[PDB]
Design a protein around this ligand. Structure first.
Ligand SMILES: N[C@H](CC(=O)O)C(=O)O
Ligand SMILES: N[C@H](CC(=O)O)C(=O)O
Lengths: 233, 232
């Protein structure tokens, strides 16, 4: 198998599902006590998230490209970045590191394509929802359009991510609020919902969503397993 | 903080608690959204475990020493081996990688010392229970003596580790069996019990053990946090 390099700790709460699912996928396919060959570089999220709020995106590109290059020196054969928001600076990593880069929005776009959908809801950080880097890629490569919440809803969704989910707090009032935003976007013709922040899956069970769920962390994980075994890749 | 290098995937089920606890420790000490600087090399456990059963220990030393050097090349400043059994080949890692090596049995020995005990029960793989690499260090470094289960019990404790815990199955039948072995070693004057395989605490809650519990994975993770912050 190929050794996968994970860029994680953004937040560490969502890096655990990647590790679990990549190990479970290798176990499923190879059997017995086989487990995944993983290299993980976990950052101090404070530096990353503070740079987000200050718009210091180039600095985060420098941090993440250096991290990927370090994993390449340790034997990584491909790169998974364990965060939707930081794909804003994917080109920094892809430029500077020759390893295959498994883009999270490509894996999600293939999943939504397979479901026959072209109009979906997108939940994520405010940056992922409002800016062009993520949605523009779904439009340009897959002709997938994203509906996003209203300004007030986006503020609260984002607040819950950074003040609760990234600190391991999963509350029912926030779970219900997320479910309520999903149902409202369903009323707008959304055919499914992208959990486009990797922590959202930890808060909202699929049972609480009235729309079919595309969990980006799970999808990305499965994409990594396919790359490691040269399937589907 | 110093970047910690973790040698994990032995099994991956017990590498998660290291990651969780080291991040929670950093969060508690630095606050806010701070998280741990971690480099992890997770192995394919099959190669390691098959080697255990064949007695191919030198090959595992080669694998883990090469992994530690790879993490050194990525920026790790200390090494944590996330497995009690594989400290049998700690010296291969330390002779090859100059990074500080945080020995799991030293962390556990300090904890047991702190609770004033010198006679404890040891559960672990059959290699950890029966051989001298682990118990010998606790005796020599800390004057701590380990009681271990009887042969039939060691067989079953070990079977549960590799056929159940390392595959993510945590049964009540096996939980009860471990609790019974712990009570039996308590009757023998054990003052606490070492969970000396990192998966055991995934199966046996503390409230299950009739003896005070030294969870090696937790104690090791706390040792890692102290090293990363230059603390204890
Ligand atoms: N977990 C990250 C959060 C972040 O990078 O801000 C995401 O999926 O967007
Ligand atoms: N988790 C490991 C098991 C192994 O290495 O076989 C231990 O603590 O012993």
């Amino acid at each position: 198998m190929k050794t996968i390099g994970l860029l994680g700790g953004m937040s560490w709460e969502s890096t655990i599902p990647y590790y679990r699912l990549i190990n479970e996928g290798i176990k499923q396919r190879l059997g017995g006590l086989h487990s995944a060959q993983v290299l993980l570089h976990s950052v101090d999220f404070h530096e990353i998230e503070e740079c987000q709020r200050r718009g210091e995106w180039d600095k985060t590109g420098d941090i993440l490209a250096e991290a990927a290059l370090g994993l390449q020196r340790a034997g990584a054969e491909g790169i998974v970045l364990c965060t939707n928001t930081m794909h804003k600076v994917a080109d920094a990593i892809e430029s500077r590191c020759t390893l295959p880069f498994l883009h999270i929005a490509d894996a999600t776009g293939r999943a939504i394509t397979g479901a026959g959908m072209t109009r979906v809801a997108l939940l994520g950080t405010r940056y992922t929802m409002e800016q062009d880097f993520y949605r523009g890629r779904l439009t340009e490569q897959f002709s997938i359009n994203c509906l996003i919440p209203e300004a007030d809803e986006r503020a609260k969704i984002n607040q819950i991510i950074f003040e609760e989910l990234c600190l391991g707090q999963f509350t029912e009032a926030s779970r219900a609020y997320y479910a309520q935003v999903i149902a409202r976007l369903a009323e707008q013709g959304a055919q499914g919902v992208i959990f486009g922040c990797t922590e959202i899956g930890l808060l909202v069970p699929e049972e609480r969503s009235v729309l079919p769920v595309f969990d980006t962390a799970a999808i990305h994980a499965e994409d990594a397993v396919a790359f490691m075994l040269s399937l589907e890749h």
